[PDB]
Amino acid sequence: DVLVKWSEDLANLPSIDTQHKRLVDYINDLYRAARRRDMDKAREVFDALKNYAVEHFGYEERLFADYAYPEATRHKEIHRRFVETVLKWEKQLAAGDPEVVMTTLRGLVDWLVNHHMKEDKKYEAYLRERGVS
Ligand SMILES: [Ca+2]
């Protein structure tokens, strides 16, 4: 049923929470598809998850710019390097190999949710003080 679950450990601004939650939803959609061995749907879901992640990263970057966040550069580059990883995964998924599926799911879970979404909390106080929600 579920591979990962958003939790209080990840709480951030309410707009950021909605996008982080929707990313969690995409990961679990991808897991359900890969589990059923429906690889066409799994690739479709992965495509949507990539595009959503890019747009979520871009939402954060716009907030960084708008609010003159001091660590905009570092954070944007961390995003950029992860997109590069996703694009590589996307290519590797073309051949539908169980091993590649797992690399992807574990990378999304281990790095995006369990690491990067926690790291996102670092901009929270700064943006909240300036009235962002
Ligand atoms: Ca093969």
Numbering used by the authors: 4 to 136
The publication says:
Despite these functional differences, all of these proteins have a carboxylate-bridged diiron active site within a four-helix bundle protein folding motif.2a,6 The coordination sphere and the environment surrounding the diiron site in these proteins have apparently evolved to optimize a variety of reactions with O2. As a target protein for engineering the coordination sphere, we have selected DcrH-Hr,8 which contains the histidine-rich coordination sphere and exhibits spectroscopic properties characteristic of all Hrs, but contains a larger substrate-accessible tunnel within the four-helix bundle compared to classical Hrs. As for classical Hrs, the diiron site of DcrH-Hr reversibly binds O2 but shows more rapid autoxidation. Herein, we report another engineered variant DcrH-Hr, I119H, of the same residue, in which alteration of the coordination sphere generates the capability of H2O2-dependent oxidation of exogenous substrates.
I119H was expressed from Escherichia coli and purified as a holo-form containing approximately 1.6 iron atoms per protein, as determined by ferrozine analysis. The diferric form (met-I119H) exhibited two absorption maxima at 325 and 375 nm, which are well-established to arise from oxo to ferric LMCT transitions in the oxo–dicarboxylate-bridged met-Hrs.1b,c,8 Resonance Raman (rR) spectra of I119H gave a characteristic peak at 499 cm–1 for the symmetric stretching Fe–Ooxo–Fe vibrational mode. The met-I119H protein was crystallized, and the structure of the oxo-bridged diiron site13 was determined by X-ray crystallographic analysis at a resolution of 1.9 Å. The overall structure of the met-I119H is similar to that of the met form of WT (met-WT) (RSMD value, 0.324).10 Surprisingly, H119 coordinates to Fe1 in the crystal structure in place of the conserved H118 ligand residue in WT. The coordination geometry of other His residues and carboxylate ligands is almost identical to that of met-WT (ESI†). A computational study of the I119H diiron site yielded alternative structures in which either H118 or H119 coordinates to the Fe1.14 It is, thus, expected that either H118 or H119 coordination would be stable in I119H in solution. Based on this observation together with the crystal structure and calculated optimized structures, we propose two conformations for I119H: H118off/H119on and H118on/H119off. In the latter case, the H119 residue is capable of forming a hydrogen bonding interaction with an exogenous ligand. Motivated by the differing reactivity of WT and I119H toward H2O2, we tested the promotion of oxidation of external substrates by these proteins. Fig. 4b demonstrates that I119H promotes oxidation of guaiacol by H2O2, as shown by the clear increase in absorption at 470 nm assigned to the oxidized guaiacol product, whereas, under the same conditions, WT does not.
